[PDB]
Amino acid sequence: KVLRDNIQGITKPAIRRLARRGGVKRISGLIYEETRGVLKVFLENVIRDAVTYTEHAKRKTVTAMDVVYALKRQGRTLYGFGG
Amino acid sequence: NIQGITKPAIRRLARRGGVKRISGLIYEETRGVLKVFLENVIRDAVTYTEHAKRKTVTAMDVVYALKRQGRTLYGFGG
Amino acid sequence: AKTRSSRAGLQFPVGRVHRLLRKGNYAERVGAGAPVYLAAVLEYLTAEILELAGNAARDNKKTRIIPRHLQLAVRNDEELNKLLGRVTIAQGGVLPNIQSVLLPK
Amino acid sequence: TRSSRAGLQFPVGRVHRLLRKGNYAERVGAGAPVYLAAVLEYLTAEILELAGNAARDNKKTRIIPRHLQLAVRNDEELNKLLGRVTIAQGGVLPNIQSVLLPK
Amino acid sequence: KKRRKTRKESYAIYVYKVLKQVHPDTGISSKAMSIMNSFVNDVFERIAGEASRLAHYNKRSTITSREIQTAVRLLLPGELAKHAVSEGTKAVTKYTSAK
Amino acid sequence: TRKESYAIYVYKVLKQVHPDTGISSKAMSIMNSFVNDVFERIAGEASRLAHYNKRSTITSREIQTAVRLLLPGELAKHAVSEGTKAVTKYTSAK
Amino acid sequence: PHRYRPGTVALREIRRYQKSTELLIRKLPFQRLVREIAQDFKTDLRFQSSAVMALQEASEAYLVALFEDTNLCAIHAKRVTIMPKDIQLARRIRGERA
Amino acid sequence: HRYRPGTVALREIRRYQKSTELLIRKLPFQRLVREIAQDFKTDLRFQSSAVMALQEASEAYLVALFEDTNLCAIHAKRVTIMPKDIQLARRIRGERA
DNA sequence: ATCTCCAAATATCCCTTGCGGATCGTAGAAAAAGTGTGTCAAACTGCGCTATCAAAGGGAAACTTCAACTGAATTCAGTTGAAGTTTCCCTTTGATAGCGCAGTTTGACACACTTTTTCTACGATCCGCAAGGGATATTTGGAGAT
DNA sequence: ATCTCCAAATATCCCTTGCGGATCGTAGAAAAAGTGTGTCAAACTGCGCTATCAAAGGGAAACTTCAACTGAATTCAGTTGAAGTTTCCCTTTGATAGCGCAGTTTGACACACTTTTTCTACGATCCGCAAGGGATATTTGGAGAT
Ligand SMILES: [Mn+2]
Ligand SMILES: [Mn+2]
Ligand SMILES: [Pt+2]
Ligand SMILES: [Pt+2]
Ligand SMILES: [Pt+2]
Ligand SMILES: [Pt+2]
Ligand SMILES: [Pt+2]
Ligand SMILES: [Pt+2]
Ligand SMILES: [Pt+2]
Ligand SMILES: [Pt+2]
Ligand SMILES: [Pt+2]
Ligand SMILES: [Pt+2]
Ligand SMILES: [Pt+2]
Ligand SMILES: [Pt+2]
Ligand SMILES: [Pt+2]
Ligand SMILES: [Pt+2]
Ligand SMILES: [Pt+2]
Ligand SMILES: [Pt+2]
Ligand SMILES: [Pt+2]
Ligand SMILES: [Pt+2]
Ligand SMILES: [Pt+2]
Ligand SMILES: [Pt+2]
Ligand SMILES: [Pt+2]
Ligand SMILES: [Pt+2]
Ligand SMILES: [Pt+2]
Ligand SMILES: [Pt+2]
Ligand SMILES: [Pt+2]
Ligand SMILES: [Pt+2]
Ligand SMILES: [Pt+2]
Ligand SMILES: [Pt+2]
Ligand SMILES: [Pt+2]
Incomplete structure (x- = not known):
């Protein structure tokens, strides 16, 4: 099913x-x-x-590590999910 | 010395x-x-410089130092 | 004394650090003292954080260290804060801090 | 030369040597220096292209660092790629904030 | 002779060649050449650096054109990424043709 | 398969420093990230130093100047001293 | 009927949220947003739930830090109210673009 | 004949934004470098390019810093840059705690 | 809104120097060849991701009221900038004095490699129990009201 | 100045869990010991380039004169975003099952690496000549005055 407009789930109170x-x-x-x-x-x-x-690894599942590596690349190292 | 960097400059x-x-x-x-x-x-x-057992501060030394501070400089041996 | 850690007077694992330097393509050859030196530095820094987080646990009437204690430890310490200036501690929150002008008057 | 087999100006042998001496990995595949040399070629082509025009626009037949600065900072993507680089002798883009100008 | 005055090594010739291909009537000052040499090295390192990690991350011993490719995709913004991936894929296609 | 971790060493050092104090699993994962992180930064800079100086080998010397470059003042002083002290002790045996 | 003056509850909300460390954006909405965005890059992606939790931790950290900078920008202009131009100023000086 | 306050300043901006020449006199800057290096290690020399590098870096840094400072000034409906502006720029840069 | 009045832009011409082409010699790339191991393709698998449902209620949305904040408007002391005078030192030019960088040759030694012996650290599993952490009630410190 | 009351903090009870301290059995990795070899420390050497020196003028920095215009303080009202209320959407939670696919396994090998000889691209070094610098004039684009 089509995913649309989900940025609105980031609500005003949040x-x-x-x-x-x-x-x-x-x-x-x-x-x-x-x-x-x-x-x-x-x-x-x-x-x-x-x-x-993920694509480089020939995987279809994005892992914590792809994200941790992605954040590292942008100079926003994250502690708590591997690496 | 620090005042050599003058108001007009x-x-x-x-x-x-x-x-x-x-x-x-x-x-x-x-x-x-x-x-x-x-x-x-x-x-x-x-x-x-110290690490290279030299007494002379090179352009490269600086370029490396500027690189570590995330301030890559082009034009001196990059 | 068998283990290289034991030789070096260390808790951190000199053999492991040796292997990780070799299989990480940092250079062709790894000298005898480099993993010793490096395991020592790693041990020291973890001791400094555990120490400071330990204190934070105690100030908050707590016995077990959680990420918020590590975060309090790190950002209340000028030097750890600088070293981890670009780092995010999952579940650490932030320092309590409200600018002056916002206080009731 | 491998460069000709690949139709590149950039030296596929050197890039290959340099990838072996930099300890990036235990082994280097045959395709990798070609692909890299090519990318390096395209990117220096790209700069020179915009730099040249900035020499032209400035009425010059020689590219100087200032033209490289104009090329880079007037191009959104190259400006991003060299976000954290200072080009020596480049100066700045002429830019004055609206509210500083007289009515 | 006998005592040789070292030997520096740069990209200056290939750069000059490429400058020809795109601006035949345009030249380049030595300082701007230095800058271009820095640019090539800088980029080279940024790229091989990623590729190295990609190989590590994936428990693999070789840097292939596949690591160079995704390194470029991570390193370069939108349009540059797209063109560089073309230019690179094509050279490999052409290189493996020639025997 | 085996998942390697610094967990055991971090407990050991934690008992030395705060003997009646525990650590949550997440807190430990963070500790493990920190150790891997600092390791990477040090080995990394050490790697460059050897390259910059046409050397094939990473010695405790590169680690030392890597440390001096990466760690802020006081932390560099003590780590440098804990480093040299362990190498000194380490050569003293065999 | 009792009424707190404007700002009093805002101040106590600051103490409250400064003491805690829980994620402040709802969990499923956030996850839909990530999937939507991934999908625009490649269809058929799946996520480890911790890949998503990681993204959320990074995102809340980023936004929280950005509001601290934004507040400093509002205060710099003798205001107490954060405004789009405050965030814009913060992002500009940070070297964040697009 | 009197130009109004700000008119020459504007002219200066155009001039300096159009050139790429260094704006700190070379020698005073050189003295400052050797003094500072002296506080770190005694008995040190410098390749002339090294000093150059430091000056290029230093001025690019400051110029960039003034752009940012100026924006903070303008953010406060001002036109004059004050230390509070530099202080804010550097904080938002994460150069300063 | 039009007429005098600077200063930067452009036009022109003669010197200067670094582009850029050419000469020559080597170190490094290519060719050819023998060797092996990392990578790939194909088979098999069960962790854990997507999918759903269903009940529960916590939190979002939409609404009214109004306190107080933003910012428009106004005033003005004084801090800057512009222009003039005055004081000071930066830059340029011509070396010569010798520091210390980097080239060269080398063999002692330290680290790589590989094989066998030893033991660390991980994955699986259980336990005392203090530490929490959630549902429920009460007391408490102070914002706001009379 | 004093009382009213609301929401965060404190107190009570129950209980789940995730932790530290075991004990376990066991793959995989570190240590031990032997051996092959290339890296780099040393010692001796040349000369590239950094320091320095001495001078002389020309322009920059410093200081001074003045008042335009800016930032800072005050005032006020329309705007707008906070607090509190009400309705009910949709997130959270807990369990289910089906299976897509991440990760482990195993043989066959293409492909990289390593070693040695042959070929040649590219660095060093050289300087004629034109793009560019620098100097002076002339045009143009605007600001400040009336
Ligand atoms: Mn063209
Ligand atoms: Mn879509
Ligand atoms: Pt990983
Ligand atoms: Pt270098
Ligand atoms: Pt030869
Ligand atoms: Pt050779
Ligand atoms: Pt094999
Ligand atoms: Pt299966
Ligand atoms: Pt409810
Ligand atoms: Pt509710
Ligand atoms: Pt105001
Ligand atoms: Pt006045
Ligand atoms: Pt001499
Ligand atoms: Pt030798
Ligand atoms: Pt009270
Ligand atoms: Pt009160
Ligand atoms: Pt445990
Ligand atoms: Pt075994
Ligand atoms: Pt041995
Ligand atoms: Pt040998
Ligand atoms: Pt000598
Ligand atoms: Pt000489
Ligand atoms: Pt004089
Ligand atoms: Pt004079
Ligand atoms: Pt003068
Ligand atoms: Pt004003
Ligand atoms: Pt009003
Ligand atoms: Pt409103
Ligand atoms: Pt199942
Ligand atoms: Pt000309
Ligand atoms: Pt005119």
């Missing part, structure tokens, strides 16, 4: 919560769509690289 | 940077900032 963790007291109504934009770009970049690691 | 840099108006306090900050930058690069550059 964006509010992350801003809180980041110390933000007041949030303009325009922030929610800017954030979605940015998240999407962030995910496109990491996922593009993870998927390339 | 700093202004010139700020201009290439696109800066039209400069607060009087900027010239001191820039000297501070430049010190920290040179310290770090030269720290690394000299580490490479």
Whole structure:
């Protein structure tokens, strides 16, 4: 079945919560769509690289390692999932 | 020595940077900032020199040092 | 004394570090002392983090180290924070910190 | 030469030697230096192409570092590829912020 | 003679050749040549570096044109990636033709 | 198949440093990432150093200057000293 | 009926979310988003659930750090309210593009 | 004849953005390098290109830094760069805690 | 909105120097050949990913109210920039003095390689039990209200 | 100044689990010991290039004069985003089964590597000549004044 418009599952309250963790007291109504934009770009970049690691391995399943390697490449090393 | 980097020189840099108006306090900050930058690069550059058992800081030493700080420089032996 | 760790006075495994340097194409040849030196450095740094995370566990009335303790440890320490400046500790959260201007007045 | 068998200006033998001396892996396949030399060729072709025009636009028959800077920073993709590189003697793109200009 | 003045080695000739292929009436200053030499080395390393890891990641002992390919895909942005993958795949096709 | 990990050594060092303190599985996975990570950065830079200096071999010397380059000030001092001390002790036997 | 003044709950939400470490975006929505995006690159991909958990950990870390920078940009402009131009400024100075 | 405040400054911007010449005088910069290297290791020499490298690096760095500082100034509806601007740029860069 | 007034842009011409082609000699690439092992293709497999359902309720969406924040508008002391005068040192030029880099030759030794002996560390499995961690109730510190 | 009350913190009980400390049996890897060999430390050498020196003028940095215009402070109201409420969507949770495919296995071998001889591309070195630099003039593009 066709996947569409899923960036809207990244809800307003969920964006509010992350801003809180980041110390933000007041949030303009325009922030929610800017954030979605940015998240999407962030995910496109990491996922593009993870998927390339998957294809290179001749696999159909994206692993924690493809993601960990993908993040490493973008200078965003992650601890907790192998490597 | 740090004052050899003069007010007019700093202004010139700020201009290439696109800066039209400069607060009087900027010239001191820039000297501070430049010190920290040179310290770090030269720290690394000299580490490479020592390691090679040389007494001369080479262009390569620097290029390597600039590379480690993630500031790759083209034009000196890359 | 049989093991190279035991020889070097070390907990971290000198043989393993030797093998990983050989099968990682860092160079054709690996000198005798390099894995010794390297296992020592690795042991030291883990001791420094465990120490600091250990303290954080105790400050939060806790007995067992979790990722939040490692994260508190790392980012409260100027030098570990720098070394892991570009690193994300899964499940670590962030430091409690609220800028001044946002406090009620 | 392997370069001719592959129709490349870039030296397939050197790239091959250099891949053996850099300890990238225990062994190097036959195709790898060809493919790499080719990519290196295409990329230097790409730069020179835009650099040249910047020599032209600037009324010159010689490419100098400044033209390489203009080529790179005026091209979105090359600007990304050399995001963390400074070209010595390149200067900057002329750029002045709107609000700094007079009405 | 007897004592030889070392021997530096660069890409300057192949670069000059490629400059011909695209700008026959255009030349290049020595400093800009230096920069191009840096560029080739830089890229070379970035690429072989990835390929090496790809080989490690996949428990394999050889760097093939397949690792170079995905290294390029990871390294280069959109359009550059696409063209470089063409230029590279074609040379290999052509190279394996010639015997 | 065998999954290698630094887990046992990290426990050992943890008992030396905080003898009545445990570590969660996730916390350990993080520790394992950290050890692999730092290892990579050191071996990596050591590799370059040997290349830059036309050498075929990684010695404790490369590790040492790799350490000096990678670790911030104080951490470089102690690690350098723990390093040399272990090599010294290690040659002293056999 | 009792009413907290504007900002009081916002401050206490900050303490609350600064103490905890749980993922703040819902789990299934996030997973659909990743699958949608993967799919635009290659069809027929499957994900280890931890590959997804990894992506989520990285994404929440990135966004949280970005809001800290965004707040610093709002405060720099004598405001208390984050705005798109704050995020834009943060991203520009970070060397993030597209 | 008097140009208004900002008019010559604008002209300067155009000039310096159009050239690629170094803007710190070579010798004062050289002294600073040797002094700093001195604090790290005594009895050291320098290939002349090495100093060059350091200057190219240093100025590119600062120029880039001023672009960023200027944006922060403008973000605050200002036109004048102040230390708070540099401080913010460097923080957002993650050069500073 | 039009007329004087700088400063950068462009036009021109004579010197300067580094492009870029040519000469020559070698180190490195190619050719040919013998050897083996990493990679590949094909067979077999069961962890764990997708898929679904179904109940439960926690959280999102949409709504009203209004407090307070943003930012528009206004004022002005004073910090900058522009232009002039004054003081100081950077840059250029011509070497000569010799530091220390890098070339060359070499054999002692340290590390690679491979085979046999020894024992570490991993995967499987169980246990005491303190540490949590969740469902339920109460007490508590202080924001906000009278 | 004092009371009301709401949500986070503290207290109570129960209980699941994931941890550390076992004991286990066992592949795989480290150590042990022997041997082959190439890397690099040393010692001796040449000369490339870094330091330095001494001078002289020309332009840059420093300092000064002034007031335009900027940033900083104050004020205020329309806007807008926070708090709280209500409705019910859709995430979470727990179990199920089917199977797609990740990962382990095994023989056949193409393909890389290694060694030696033969061929040649590319670095070193050389300098004539034109693209570019530098100097002076003339055109053009704008700002500040009236
Ligand atoms: Mn063309
Ligand atoms: Mn799609
Ligand atoms: Pt892995
Ligand atoms: Pt080099
Ligand atoms: Pt020869
Ligand atoms: Pt040869
Ligand atoms: Pt074999
Ligand atoms: Pt099966
Ligand atoms: Pt409910
Ligand atoms: Pt609810
Ligand atoms: Pt305001
Ligand atoms: Pt005044
Ligand atoms: Pt001499
Ligand atoms: Pt020899
Ligand atoms: Pt109270
Ligand atoms: Pt109160
Ligand atoms: Pt366990
Ligand atoms: Pt065995
Ligand atoms: Pt032996
Ligand atoms: Pt030998
Ligand atoms: Pt000599
Ligand atoms: Pt001489
Ligand atoms: Pt003088
Ligand atoms: Pt003079
Ligand atoms: Pt003068
Ligand atoms: Pt203003
Ligand atoms: Pt109002
Ligand atoms: Pt609203
Ligand atoms: Pt099943
Ligand atoms: Pt000309
Ligand atoms: Pt005009």
